[PDB]
Amino acid sequence: PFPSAVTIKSWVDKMQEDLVTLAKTASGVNQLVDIYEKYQDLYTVEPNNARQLVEIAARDIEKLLSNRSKALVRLALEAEKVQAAHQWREDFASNEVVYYNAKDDLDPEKEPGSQRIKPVFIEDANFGRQISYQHAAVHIPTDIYEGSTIVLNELNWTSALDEVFKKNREEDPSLLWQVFGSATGLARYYPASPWVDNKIDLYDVRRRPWYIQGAASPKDMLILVDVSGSVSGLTLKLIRTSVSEMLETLSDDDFVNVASFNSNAQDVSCFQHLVQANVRNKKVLKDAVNNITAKGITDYKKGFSFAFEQLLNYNVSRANCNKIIMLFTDGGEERAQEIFNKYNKDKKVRVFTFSVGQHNYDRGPIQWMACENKGYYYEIPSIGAIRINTQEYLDVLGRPMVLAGDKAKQVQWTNVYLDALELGLVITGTLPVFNITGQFENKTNLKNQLILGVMGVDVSLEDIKRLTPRFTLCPNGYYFAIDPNGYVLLHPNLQPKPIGVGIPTINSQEPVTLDFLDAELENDIKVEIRNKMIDGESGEKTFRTLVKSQDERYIDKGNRTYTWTPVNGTDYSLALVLPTYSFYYIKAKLEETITQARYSETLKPDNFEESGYTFIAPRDYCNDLKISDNNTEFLLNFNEFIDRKTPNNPSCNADLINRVLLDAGFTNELVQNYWSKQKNIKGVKARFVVTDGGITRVYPKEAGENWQENPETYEDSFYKRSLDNDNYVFTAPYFNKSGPGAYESGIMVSKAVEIYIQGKLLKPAVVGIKIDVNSWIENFTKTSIRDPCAGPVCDCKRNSDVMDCVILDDGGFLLMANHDDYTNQIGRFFGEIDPSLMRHLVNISVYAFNKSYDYQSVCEPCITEQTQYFFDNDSKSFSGVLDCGNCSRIFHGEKLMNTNLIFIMVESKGTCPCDTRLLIQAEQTSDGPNPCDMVKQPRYRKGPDVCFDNNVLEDYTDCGGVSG
């Protein structure tokens, strides 16, 4: 009938024995272990005190941020003093102001008051661009004239900042950028570089997120759009565009909701109270306002009574300060005094009124509302005025923090965002600058309640990664830092790409905000740990977690130890993740000049012939040594460096070089002594070895070309996978790819090398075997079938018409099968080939599944969904009946004990028809979580506590109605 359980347990046992014996006696795990023990005294074991490493890194980050803050402080002081000393000239001799303008052609071969500079740019690898240190540059947006009186008057008093720009760089050479945004629109950054290279420049320094952060406090904005018969036509389009643009000026710390009202007010989107101005909530609001219609007869007394009620809802999270209402209308006759006298007598809610479009309605009432209720009045007559008339409310909002004196001047760091000058991921510290003309003597306070601008220095994430070395840990260990909003500052899965917002509809300005829980969301532990780090505490938590493999196909149930501590002085919280086996590391010895010689004579370009092709990790060892994408150039440069100097003395990383050469010696001794004895083996294609220390040695010469793995050891998916497993790990290859398939490269199986120095545990290397496909094909069809069993086939064969015999891994990917058509699809997900059996396996809990969302992904027409499968029963019997399509197929599943594979044998697939409903495991473009449900249960966050939203000294005469 069907093969018995004992027959299956013998067949799988024999296949196990064969594969495990071949892997153990071919890859030489025990031999390499013995080599590591018996070459002791060349290295020492050192602890990884997480409680000390995280503290040291936190202090380093604090010192970096204090260095970058002192420059801002002194720059702000100098700018304030110079502006106080300035004189308002209204007549220039056409050559009195001198600057670069950073946007002119370098070769004009040819103004009202300015004389241009022809500078010299050489190069700088620190920036990638061409820079000049002799002077700063100026960026004046296209819309604004470069020769108006106000611009030239600013150019004079901002020319003085160049000396301080130079001085700060002289103190700390690592400064990247030092920008001074101005309230008039121009910006001055110290390293003089041309502006960015369809080329119409829409940049405006008064709209960048750092300027907006430093110019005011977190807001509670409620946009009150007016829908009516009058606003139909062009006015509606202008209102739509204006609402979108003004939404673009909000930040993560700000809460916003959009309402509309023709005769009874209603929410324009699913949100009902208030939502954080994330990159998703803003998109939802933009779509809702873009799907709006104009009908009915305007009723202000209901719209305002609705807005004031939604600004009083305290059941939800909000910034709890700067409660401001925006009215986008055209014009009317009702001023609604009763509503304001009912809701806002103490005047705690600001009202800004906008008169959008070209009309002839009475604008008087809206100016009156903007005057009585503390605010300002705007007009948008065309598309070109939307940007300016929507970016100006920060000028009104910044008055109370100006009147606070030298108390609102605190350095505040922004979110991670891509630099405008193509520098990668950077964060910016902002410090406002106040107008203090006539401050020493008490005469002038008329215009002294507006900021001059916001200073800013950029620090790259590369510096912060430099402050947190990761080469003394295992590849599974890393650092990460979280701001109070939950977003990651450092994390290995944070990449320089904009955050996806939804499905890419058919037919670089946004911040890169990735929450911590978008690494592997675990309800029990990684939520409480996140909430503790956000609160600003320190602790340790050892727990059994799930880690997603680097290739994003496998999941391991490993043990990790989360240690965190706050970065005191700032708001970021640093944490360090360490597994149990990474509590110790091998520190190489000084050895002697002789050891360097023969440890270097192993990895020469002409020499990897009897030792196998040798890789090297592009880790910066020496300052002169340069990282190269191609491994051969790095190998040659490393050889010439280690030949030409000693490692330690010439201001190089002694530990890194010493450990690399120690690994080279150990691996060379291993490959020679053991692998050189047996040149060819029946079932292996390539013997490889990867060690912590950035060296890889594929023994066969012709097999070195097929090595598609990353030369960096700490970024190999198989290495990290094998580190977390105490047994042999089988890596499924790729299917339908332009590279070599699993017929000339082989199947990769790897085992983690384990050593016991003293009593401590260490896993410094991973060895493995590339299994020949054809040998295992001819071995699989003779150890499974009984010869004199029956007329009908009891088991499978090379072409089994009925019986199906496949072997899988712990990720659902197929490795072998009896049928030629099946084995032609090696590495393919078994759900695609046989969906019904996979679905039944999942239902009877054979492969657990749990999915994640990838936000930094690109799509061909974007958020992307992912799925990974693994074991969840750690048992062997696993017997059941499909009952598929009224054609029952009895199936038996057995798992090879030492390896991570499972042997599942079904009666047949083609004979019994079933539904297909293909079970795909590949990434699919899809919308993320529903924003409405997400905001119904918001995540934990801690908003800033400082806020300046009211002051009795503030002057309210500047209403905007009488001023134009």
Ligand X SMILES: *[C@@H]1O[C@H](CO)[C@@H](O[C@@H]2O[C@H](CO)[C@@H](O)[C@H](O)[C@H]2NC(C)=O)[C@H](O)[C@H]1NC(C)=O
Ligand Y SMILES: *[C@@H]1O[C@H](CO)[C@@H](O[C@@H]2O[C@H](CO)[C@@H](O[C@@H]3O[C@H](CO)[C@@H](O)[C@H](O)[C@H]3NC(C)=O)[C@H](O)[C@H]2NC(C)=O)[C@H](O)[C@H]1NC(C)=O
Ligand Z SMILES: *[C@@H]1O[C@H](CO)[C@@H](O[C@@H]2O[C@H](CO)[C@@H](O[C@@H]3O[C@H](CO)[C@@H](O[C@@H]4O[C@H](CO)[C@@H](O)[C@H](O)[C@H]4NC(C)=O)[C@H](O)[C@H]3NC(C)=O)[C@H](O)[C@H]2NC(C)=O)[C@H](O)[C@H]1NC(C)=O
Q: Are 180 and 137 in contact (CB under 8 A)?
A: no
**Smallest gap, in angstroms, from Cβ of residue 436 to ligand Z?**
8
CB of 160 to ligand Y, least distance (A): 5
Indicate whether 305 belongs to the interface with ligand X (CB under 6 A). Answer: no
> How many residues of this chain bind Ca ion (CB under 5 A)?
3
From the list ligand NAG, ligand X, ligand Z, none, pick the one residue 59 interacts with, judged by a Cβ distance below 5 to 8 Å according to partner type.
ligand X
Which residue, chain included where needed, has tokens 């260490």?
762
Q: Is 159 in the site for ligand Z (CB under 6 A)?
A: no
156: partner contacted, choices Ca ion, ligand Y, ligand NAG, none (Cβ within 5-8 A by kind): ligand Y
Residues 6+ apart with CB under 8 A from 128: 422, 423
CB of 84 to ligand Z, least distance (A): 9
Region near ligand Z per CB under 6 A, out of 33-41, 446-454, 637-645, 886-894: 446-454
- CB closer to ligand X out of 16 and 867: 867
Q: Which is nearer to ligand Z, 437 or 561 (CB)?
A: 437
Annotated binding site: 226, 228, 230
Q: Which structure tokens are listed for 355?
A: 């008169």
Q: Contact at 8 Å (CB) between 388 and 380?
A: no
Q: What 3-state class would DSSP assign to 56?
A: helix
Interface with ligand Z (CB under 6 A), residue from 6, 41, 88, 91: 88
Contact 334, 302 (CB under 8 A): no
The count of C-alpha atoms lying within 13 angstroms of the C-alpha of 841, restricted to the half-sphere facing its C-beta, is: 30
Would you count residue 172 as binding ligand NAG (CB under 6 A)?
Answer: yes
Q: How far is the CB of 60 from ligand NAG (least distance, A)?
A: 6
Q: Which residues carry a binding-site annotation for a divalent metal cation?
A: 226, 228, 230
Of 97 and 670, the one with the shorter C-beta distance to ligand Y is 97
Breaks (C-N over 2.5 A) in the chain follow: 110, 197, 507, 861
Map 389-437 to HEC letters.
HHCCHHHHHCHHHHHCCCCCCCCEECCCEECCCCCCEEEEEEEEEECCC
Please say which residue, 126 or 272, places its beta carbon nearer to ligand X. 272
Closest to ligand NAG by CB, 79 or 464: 464
Minimum CB distance to ligand Y, residue 155 (Å): 8
DSSP type of residue 273:
S
- State the nearest-atom distance from the C-beta of 186 to ligand Z, in Å: 11
Residue 171 binds what, of ligand NAG, Ca ion, ligand Z, none (CB under 5 to 8 Å, by partner type)? ligand NAG
Stretch that binds ligand NAG, among 60-68, 303-311, 371-379, 585-593 (CB under 6 A): 60-68
Q: Which residue in 69, 83, 156, 228 binds Ca ion (CB under 5 A)?
A: 228
Q: Which is nearer to ligand Y, 159 or 639 (CB)?
A: 159
Residue type, 790: A
Q: What's the closest the beta carbon of residue 59 comes to ligand NAG, in angstroms? A: 9
User: Residue 516's closest CA among 549, 564, 481?
Assistant: 481
The residue among 383 and 446 lying less far from ligand Z, judged by its C-beta, is 446
> What is the gyration radius of the CA atoms in the chain, in angstroms?
34
Give 659-686 as a DSSP string: HHHHHHHHHHHHHHHTGGG-S--SSEEE
Instruction: Say how far residue 345 (Cα) sits from the centre of its chain.
Output: 46
Query: Can you tell me which of 67, 852, 857, 950 binds ligand NAG, judged by CB under 6 A?
Result: 67
Distances (CA, A) of 913 to 98, 814, 887, 920: 82, 21, 8, 19
Which of 896, 923, 905, 899 is closest to 829 using CA atoms? 923
Part in contact with ligand Z (CB under 6 A); list of ranges 128-136, 439-447, 521-529, 690-698: 439-447
Of 36 and 870, which CB lies nearer to ligand X in the complex structure? Answer: 870
CB nearer to ligand X: pick between 267 and 591:
267
Residue 148 or residue 531: which is nearer to ligand Z going by CB? 148
Site string (447-486) toward ligand Z, x via CB under 6 A: xx---x----------------------------------
- Residue 869 φ then ψ, to 5°: -120, 150
* Structure tokens given for 148: 């108006």
Short-list 145, 228, 177, 195, CA closest to 71? 177
Should residue 568 be labelled a site residue for ligand X when binding is judged by CB under 6 A? Answer: yes
- 127-156 residues near ligand Z, rule: CB under 6 A: none
Residue 64 binding result from ligand X, ligand Z, ligand NAG, none, given CB thresholds of 5 to 8 Å by partner type: ligand NAG
Q: How far apart, in whole angstroms, are the C-alpha atoms of residue 124 and residue 127?
A: 6
Q: What end-to-end distance do the CA atoms of the chain give, in Å?
A: 96
Of 90, 106, 107, 315, which one interacts with ligand X (CB under 6 A)? 315
Residue 157's Cβ-count burial label (10 Å; 0-12, 13-18, 19+) is middle
Task: List b or e across 317-354, with b for residues whose CB sees 16 or more CB atoms inside 10 angstroms.
Answer: bbbebbbbbbbbbbbbeebbeebbeebbeeeebbbbbb
Minimum Å gap between C-beta 421 and ligand NAG is 22
To ligand X, the closest distance from the beta carbon of 172 in angstroms equals: 21
Q: How far is CA 540 from CA 346, 525, 559, 638, 666, in A?
A: 49, 12, 13, 40, 36
Q: Find the binding residues for ligand X in span 505-524 (CB under 6 A).
A: 523
φ, ψ dihedrals at 192, nearest 5°: -70, 110
Comparing CB distances to ligand NAG, the nearer of 459 and 773 is 459
Binder to Ca ion among 298, 310, 389, 545 (CB under 5 A)? 298
Q: Judged by CB, which is closer to ligand X: 45, or 546? A: 546
Counted residue by residue, the chain has a size of 964
**Which region among 55-63, 145-153, 395-403, 880-888 touches ligand X (by CB under 6 A)?**
55-63
| Partner interacting with residue 16 (select from ligand NAG, ligand Z, ligand Y, none; CB below 5-8 Å by kind) | none
CA distance 231 to 239: 9
Rounded distance between C-alpha atoms, residue 818 and residue 59, angstroms: 60
90 scored as a contact of ligand Z (CB under 6 A)? yes
Longest dimension (CA), the chain: 112
Question: 3-class SS at 66?
Answer: helix
- Residue 172, contacted partner among ligand Z, ligand NAG, ligand Y, none, CB below 5-8 A by kind: ligand NAG
**Residues within the interface to ligand Y (CB under 6 A):** 96, 156-157, 159-160
- Burial class, 114, CB count within 10 angstroms (exposed 0-12 / middle 13-18 / buried 19+): buried
Residue ranges binding Ca ion (CB under 5 A): 228, 230, 298
Q: Where along the sequence are the contacts to ligand NAG (CB under 6 A)? A: 60, 63-64, 67, 171-172, 174
Residues near ligand Z, by CB under 6 A: 88, 90, 435, 437, 444, 446-448, 452
